[PDB]
Each structure stands twice: as structure tokens, then as C-alpha cells.
Design a protein around this ligand. Sequence first.
Ligand SMILES: C=CCCn1cc(-c2nc(Nc3ccc(C4CCNCC4)cc3)nc3[nH]ccc23)cn1
Length: 289
Amino acid sequence: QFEERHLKFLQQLGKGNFGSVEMCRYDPLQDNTGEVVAVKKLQHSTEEHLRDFEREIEILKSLQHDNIVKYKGVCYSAGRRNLKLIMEYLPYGSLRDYLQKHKERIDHIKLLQYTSQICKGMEYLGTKRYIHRDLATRNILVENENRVKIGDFGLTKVLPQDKEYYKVKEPGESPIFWYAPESLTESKFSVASDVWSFGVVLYELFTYIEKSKSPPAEFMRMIGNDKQGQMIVFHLIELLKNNGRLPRPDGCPDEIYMIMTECWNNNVNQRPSFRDLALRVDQIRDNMA
Ligand SMILES: C=CCCn1cc(-c2nc(Nc3ccc(C4CCNCC4)cc3)nc3[nH]ccc23)cn1
């Protein structure tokens, strides 16, 4: 629906897995009246990354939720080359950068509002049997001060109709400090592994994205910064199996930290559901108000 000749590049917004996102104005009338949009592209169009990108486009197009970034259309050139995903532009950027900049004027009640919106969006994904596999504050976008949206689905997979997990091992670098143990050991991804990752997102929010408090920084210090290459994931696996966890962030209440630790259960089946997470968060949020 979007013609490439009317997409005017403005600036780069971010770079994720196998591609980037650009700020563009779609100005078909060429009179500077078109809306600003976000455009995702692949940095190199391999036929494996292309079909993964086409599956990502179909996944986002089928999601309609207040806390999921809105799909707008597609755009390609020469026949069907240079596929581009057109999304709504969210003016405040990623939640990670937003929280780090406004940390002094974002209180705990506001964090729980973001936490509850992420949970409702994740529950919506579960009803479609989608596994996000990449939940992190860098992948959450801020529409305004009162609303956030899950903003990237490059690693999202559809569950098989006969199983409740999806096995996959991507060649490259994986966000192992957000990964559930069964994802590190067996490459199994499920709703329960998304719940593990959500607990790390909750940890991120209450550290206010502080320098030395990031999950990679805390985990690499616990296993020792001595560890090299593949012995990092080996020592991370052993640390989690012995119930080594991220510490409680400064100023985080006990009831909020216990939600994280309950999300960080080695027993896959004992982790809470996203509906129960939204319930406990909402009731805590109401008690504070
Ligand atoms: C989710 C992470 C995957 C990759 N990714 C996607 C995005 C993204 N960003 C935005 N808006 C935006 C982003 C950064 C800034 C900053 C602020 C300070 N000055 C420079 C610009 C301002 C607005 N809208 C979007 N729609 C759909 C995606 C998307 C970013 N990274």
C-alpha cells in the first residue's frame, strides 16, 4: 500500500536482530503533509532472514491490541525485493531509553502501570499461541507518558498445535541474560519462558536502567567477569540451577521482588500466568493509590 518513492528518510531509530528501524515521512502528495512512520528493514536480505521477516510481518498484522505497536502496511521495490514493514511511529522511543532519561519523575505507581500494560499485551499474545522470546525494555515502546506497547516481534514464533513449547536455536548471539534455564539448556521456548523473561523486564524497570544494575552486569559479576565465550552460558546455567538470582533493586518493595522471584522459578509449570501477574500488579497498584 506504501510506495517506496514517497518514503522520505529522516533518521535511524534503532537496530535490532538482522535489520534496523528508520524514521520516515510518507509524503505521497510531496507537500510535507504526510504522517511520520516507522519503517523496519533487513540489513541484508538472506532468504532465511526474508521468510522470517515475512512471518514477522504476518504476525504483527494479525495483532490488534492497545499495548501492541500498530501495523500500517508493507512496501517493496523491484518486483518484490527490499521488503519493508511500515508501523506507527511512537514519539518517545523505547521504554529503556525513556525510563533512563526521566527516572527522577517516574514513580513506582507509574512503573506498575507500564508493568500491567505489558502483561495484558503478553496475555493477548498467548491467546494466539505466540511466543515472543525477546521480552526486554529495549523492545518496549512508549506512545505517551501513560501508555507503552510491545514494539518488536522479530523472534516471535507460533506454537505447534500439538505441543506447548517451541524448540529453536538461532545461529548468532542470543539474549541469554533474559533466557529461562530450559531455554539455555534445551532451547525450549514457551509461555512460561516468556514469563521468566517478563520477570527480568520487571527487574529492569525497578533498576531504572542504572549503569551497574543491568542483568548482564549483575550476572557476569556473580559468575565472575573471568568467564570467556561459551563458558559464560555454561556458568549461567549452573548459577540458575543453584537458585542464583538477580538481586532486589534499590527501593523495590518486597512484594514486587517476590513477583520477580516467582517468575524466576526453575520449575516451568510453577511459574504464574500473565493473567495472575496482571491481577497481583493491579491490586498492588490500587493499594498504593
Ligand atoms: C523495539 C525495538 C526494536 C527496534 N526498534 C524499533 C524502534 C521504534 N521506535 C519508534 N520511535 C522512536 C524511537 C527512538 C526515538 C529516540 C528518542 C531520542 N532521539 C532519537 C530517537 C524516538 C522515537 N517507533 C517505532 N515503531 C515501531 C518500532 C519503533 C526503535 N528500535
